[PDB]
Design an enzyme around this catalytic site. Sequence first.
Site, short mmCIF file in Angstrom:
data_model
loop_
_atom_site.label_atom_id
_atom_site.label_comp_id
_atom_site.label_asym_id
_atom_site.label_seq_id
_atom_site.Cartn_x
_atom_site.Cartn_y
_atom_site.Cartn_z
N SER A 1 2.58 4.43 3.99
CA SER A 1 3.24 4.74 2.72
C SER A 1 2.17 5.17 1.73
O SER A 1 1.23 4.42 1.47
N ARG A 2 2.28 6.39 1.20
CA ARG A 2 1.31 6.93 0.24
C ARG A 2 1.47 6.34 -1.15
O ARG A 2 0.53 6.43 -1.94
N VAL A 3 2.60 5.72 -1.46
CA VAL A 3 2.76 5.01 -2.73
C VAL A 3 1.93 3.74 -2.76
O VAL A 3 1.28 3.46 -3.77
N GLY A 4 1.89 3.02 -1.64
CA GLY A 4 1.07 1.83 -1.46
C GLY A 4 1.54 0.64 -2.28
O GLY A 4 2.73 0.45 -2.53
#
Lengths: 114, 91, 117, 279
Positions: free
Chosen positions: B9-12
């Site tokens: 997930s690039r939002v993290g």
Amino acid sequence: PAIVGDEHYRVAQEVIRILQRYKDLQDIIAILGIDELSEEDKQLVNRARRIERFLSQNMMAAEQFTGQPGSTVPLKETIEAFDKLTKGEFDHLPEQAFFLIGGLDDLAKKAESL
Amino acid sequence: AINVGVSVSRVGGAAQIKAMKEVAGSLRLDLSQYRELEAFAAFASDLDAASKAQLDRGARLVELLKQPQYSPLAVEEQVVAIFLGTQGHLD
Amino acid sequence: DLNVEIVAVERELWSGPATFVFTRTTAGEIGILPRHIPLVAQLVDDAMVRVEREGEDDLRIAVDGGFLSVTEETVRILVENAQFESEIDADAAKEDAASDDERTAAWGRARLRALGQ
Amino acid sequence: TLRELRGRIRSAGSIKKITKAQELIATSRIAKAQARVEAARPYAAEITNMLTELAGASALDHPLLVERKQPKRAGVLVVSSDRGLCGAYNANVLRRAEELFSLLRDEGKDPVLYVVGRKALGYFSFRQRTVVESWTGFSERPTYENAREIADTLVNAFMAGLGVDELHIVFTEFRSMLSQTAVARRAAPMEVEYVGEYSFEPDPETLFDALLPRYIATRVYAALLEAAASESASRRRAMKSATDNADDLIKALTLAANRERQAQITQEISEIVGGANAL
């Protein structure tokens, strides 16, 4: 060694050799623990740990969060610092002294205050 | 069946409550260490005790991430479920 | 004082200073004191070794197939297998002494002897 | 075919993991084996000393110290692995054994075989020379209780002289983790070696007749311990080789699966735009 100096090229090749040895040894380090290595292999890992740490820098993007100013390190000071560090001239300092530090004079400043 | 360690997930952490960040931040590291060590499952006696305690932990975290369908856990309950694993009460 | 070393075939099993050491041999029982003649002797099949110690209580050993050797500077006991009285089991030793196999019955009697019986 | 190549990459990528695991396990077991060798070393040195003192006092008439009048047969103990994957370890052992046999039969002794380890027992099951006795279950973890029985059986075959006039052992001598070789040693009859410069109970001859069977047992045990150290050191070396070969196979297959992926896509496009140009 045609574009960068012969000294730069030698130092960068030695830093790669040490970090390649340490990357090969990290399997043994994780599976068997450090004691399985010889005295010479642990003498290499003691340097490799400090070399990989000394590639970290307090930089002007981190000034937003840490508040401490980002450091510029000159090319000659970078070469001369890694030439001394790969020869082991800082083996007696702890790894924490090399995290997020802005060259050799700043390494001395952190290490003596730690 | 989520293949963690290629799934991303690039939002993290911005998408997690603080209790979930503090409890689960180590979970990816423990599962990446177990995903290396699973090749030594045949040699658990010869393996060094410091990593033997990562292999049995990883196996208990992989069991902890299994879940029957149509049984979604509220966040309050899966914070405690991940806590059982990462704090080692399952050990 | 005696430098006493109990050396097993696979391990340097025990070593220390001693005041006295007792063993039973194919020439009867024998005690050794801080000065002794240079000796070689084979221990009996159901052997025990008792070591007197200056720093603590005496040490009790059961020994299989041991050979005593003495020189002026040290006593070396060379042993196939050895067990301390603090590690022998009374039921296991009693069951071994009841066995029909001569070596197993000897090792059972040896562990019973280290247990004072 | 891409499905075949993907299957072969998945296979080779499991094998690379499993050989790297066993290279690291062998890197542990060479340290355990060297520890057991160095723990057994002081006993072997002190039995050697006691045997030199007893022989100095003895008449030396003991059977294990004299050449038989007829060299009727020779016993050969061959030490080898139970587990596989050891690389050239068993090949070196069995090649040194067959050199020893060519020498013995050139002197005029036919060898009779005793075997430790299941792999040499397979080799001498295939080549039609018999094995007199074997043992198998311990070549990676030899306990003294095993070497006792081996040395009893060898000495009983020497003293029977149906019996042997001499006996030997063939095994690899661990000398470093980077260097081992198969070596052949004559265990009986022993040489005596006079060299430049005690009470015995009950007598020096009675002790020397009791101690030589124990010396042969400790020299067999030290041979099984060095065999197990060099087994693990060859398993390390050969499983490092098998990991580097499985990585060079994953590389070559990944390059082939990429060339096939690109050819499959190129071909599929060529067929689609061919069907658009035809309309």
